[PDB]
Amino acid sequence: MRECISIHVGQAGVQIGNACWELYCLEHGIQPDGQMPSDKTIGGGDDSFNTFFSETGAGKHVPRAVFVDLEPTVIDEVRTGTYRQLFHPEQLITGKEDAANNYARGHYTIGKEIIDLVLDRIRKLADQCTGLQGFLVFHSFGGGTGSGFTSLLMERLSVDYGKKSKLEFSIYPAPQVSTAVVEPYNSILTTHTTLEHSDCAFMVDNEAIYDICRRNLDIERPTYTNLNRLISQIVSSITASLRFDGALNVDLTEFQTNLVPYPRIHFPLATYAPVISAEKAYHEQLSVAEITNACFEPANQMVKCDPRHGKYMACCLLYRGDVVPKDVNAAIATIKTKRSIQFVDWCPTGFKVGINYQPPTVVPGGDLAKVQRAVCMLSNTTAIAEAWARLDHKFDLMYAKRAFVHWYVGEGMEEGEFSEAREDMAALEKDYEEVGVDSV
Amino acid sequence: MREIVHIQAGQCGNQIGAKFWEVISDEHGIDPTGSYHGDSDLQLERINVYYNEATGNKYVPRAILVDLEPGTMDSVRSGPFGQIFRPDNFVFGQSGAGNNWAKGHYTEGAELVDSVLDVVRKESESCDCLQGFQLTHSLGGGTGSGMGTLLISKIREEYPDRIMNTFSVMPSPKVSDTVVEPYNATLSVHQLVENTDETYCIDNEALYDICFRTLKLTTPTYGDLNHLVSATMSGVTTCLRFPGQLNADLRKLAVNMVPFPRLHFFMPGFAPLTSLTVPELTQQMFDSKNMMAACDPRHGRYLTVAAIFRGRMSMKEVDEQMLNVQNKNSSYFVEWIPNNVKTAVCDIPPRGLKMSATFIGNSTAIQELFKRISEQFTAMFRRKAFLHWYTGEGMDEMEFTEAESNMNDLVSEYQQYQDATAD
Amino acid sequence: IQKAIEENNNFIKMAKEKLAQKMESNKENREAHLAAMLERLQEKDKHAEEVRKNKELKE
Ligand SMILES: Nc1nc2c(ncn2[C@@H]2O[C@H](COP(=O)(O)OP(=O)(O)OP(=O)(O)O)[C@@H](O)[C@H]2O)c(=O)[nH]1
Ligand SMILES: Nc1nc2c(ncn2[C@@H]2O[C@H](COP(=O)(O)OP(=O)(O)O)[C@@H](O)[C@H]2O)c(=O)[nH]1
Ligand SMILES: [Ca+2]
Ligand SMILES: [Mg+2]
Ligand SMILES: [Mg+2]
């Protein structure tokens, strides 16, 4: 039980999905053909890794995943790639025409033609679960499918599965690798439509990942492959508690209790360390204290913002590898006495700690050094609202002139949806301001 | 498997169209017989965009050749790659247009348009998922200008949800003494403003000045002008023909380039132009001397820009130089469209160059082009000169006035958003 | 527990209706957009008929 279904939407979601599931197979010892010699229960089982992998009678371990894109060329690489034998053909769903970077086409014109088939395939996976826990939805903000079709899917999933939990991994746009001028529009539209249907969303700022690859890994011009392999490690750290077990393991849902004080305030900031190349990691062992200190270096954040200028509502530390509580507690004590960690006055200040003893894995030919211990911090900070402000500002600049709006109206949308979505974002920025104010 | 249907109408349209297929056929490794003899698999990965693959492994351009006289299309068939085109896709008449927009739009062209649609229809049916159409033609003639804009309207009636692209050649007194060109061009722009999504303005005035001033050609020929059109057309279609992330299809290009539906007239640019570093490619790419439209971009503001670099080079250096040009020229990019310059890189360079750069700009400075045509239009319309060529075909005086007003309004719209401010 | 069931059912209910209204309002708007486009094009064809008739009568 406690199965988790992953849904990868659009190019960004699909390609990140490829990197994640490759990394999962290596962490669990699953071969590209789905075989897992260490698994002695054939056809099924209740092991921790079965939350993400189902099992066939022939010994194949199949991701509990659906890949969906409105054009086929990205998923076609999966169909012909190294892990093509990993997925059943029906898990990889493609249309013929994409959303042309237009939320309206992903949510309406083009998306409505495939939504029923997607829900049918998700249902096929859910029926195989004896205790479905929820969904993980990987998508970009800027793409027409990642924004428009995701919102449609999320709305439909709330209908078909009630309040069953839905988590997002959302790719926040960056000019260095962006492909459409209207990505601010699509970002605001999908954030507004999905807000009430998402329980927890981890935003990944492509510019933050871009800078990290340049600064920490000395990659001159990072590609999506560079970015996605780093993103995989963070996603892996977050889901490791669901896929492995241990005495000191803490379930992701338990962190969730602390990370979400109000339904709309459900955007944790993730920070990951250590990101180091093999050259620098050689003969340099990074202790628990050093990787923990790195979690409070804003340059290692997954979203560009300054927590030193906001207030904390929760701090979670997800360690993996050779880590014991003694060294964790000592490291935390040092950090509080030397960092600006200001909590809101209505939250406790303790850090919530989890430790998965399975050490991190790296994909062959990657840029990340293989380390004995890693950590991902998940904090709820008012500073993440900076990401909304930057995006909302670009929205206002274009919408004041109605620039490009005709592409959305032409597909059936109304200006009222734009203003409605923008007002919801203004209220969200306002909500993050109010929760930071001291109590009277 | 996202097909484009190509149409070339009239003398100009068929000539630049023929050379367009010659160039891209070489880039994709297609010989005049339709067989592939290339060395890279990147040549065939998106071949279906512009080529059908008839059994036997020969590739046939998804092209339709139209003209109200057989002259120009007979030289195409008897020239290089003339045997690659599908003989059924040749649709021609005998009357001709006599450089009369009304003849090609209302009378002679209306007689032949139905047979052309039959071919467009047949080609579109066999498309996995049609993107849209691209038309090559001139606006100063009769067939390409008149019957071309007619075909646009009839195709749009049957494919209203598809993208309509045009490569439109603007007339210039330096490359035609034919005097009724301002009329034919103004009447054409009237249609393009309403029924096209994307129009590349191939200004003959700019092509002439490039050949004469830059390339030192005392007597530029139509062949000299066309070598620039071919290099330009190859550049602006690279993203459609090769694997890439940016503007990989006609609709995504339109969404990135057209902030307002009427303002869909682009200023092409190419570098190098020689009778080479990345910083020089980018500087020249933004220089007025390298624009295929006779407009100075420093006389207006950029709404949107697409930059395409071809050849093996440092992507880090390209990104740096593209940021450098925008920062040092921020005044010429509107504030209210953030991140309005997008850049693509293709490892395959054009023929004969180790690296090149193609520029696609939606600049308010394009009004200088329409202002030039409008000035030539009003100079004659004020005298009612040569109107009997058009009223004799049934046209009314208002239709001239309406086309005039609509083109003058288009100019005002470019000035409006040029004067627009963020605060 | 009955109140928990009622609220969850009302959330499903209202989400189903809001989406059904959006997809219906969107279909009607897009169809109206295309209807105006073709009605303008068909007006051009009607105008082309007048031109050809205005010439025929001139003879
Ligand atoms: N980190 C990361 N970002 C990506 C990747 N692929 C695309 N993006 C980002 O996603 C945004 C564009 O959305 P896409 O996912 O490519 O588009 P889509 O979801 O397929 O939607 P359409 O193509 O319009 O139908 C841009 O901001 C890209 O920078 C990826 O592999 N990794
Ligand atoms: N660049 C270029 N322009 C041309 C060519 N042929 C004609 N033109 C231009 O097109 C205009 C004449 O229209 P034309 O195409 O010859 O008439 P049509 O046969 O009715 O389409 C003139 O302004 C010419 O400058 C050509 O081969 N190349
Ligand atoms: Ca098992
Ligand atoms: Mg896509
Ligand atoms: Mg001629």
Residue numbers in the entry:
A (entry chain C): 1 to 440
B (entry chain D): 1 to 42, 45 to 277, 286 to 360, 369 to 441
C (entry chain E): 83 to 141
Task: Please give sentences taken from the publication describing this entry.
Microtubules (MTs) are ubiquitous cytoskeletal polymers built from α/β-tubulin heterodimers that assemble into a pseudo-helical cylinder. Tubulin exists in two different conformations related to its polymerization state: curved (depolymerized) and straight (assembled into MTs). The binding and hydrolysis of guanosine nucleotides rule the polymerization-depolymerization of tubulin through chemical-linked conformational stages. GDP-tubulin remains inactive in the cytoplasm and the GTP exchange at the exchangeable site (E) on β-tubulin activates the α/β-heterodimers, providing interacting surfaces prone to the addition onto growing bent sheets or protofilaments (PFs) at the MT end.
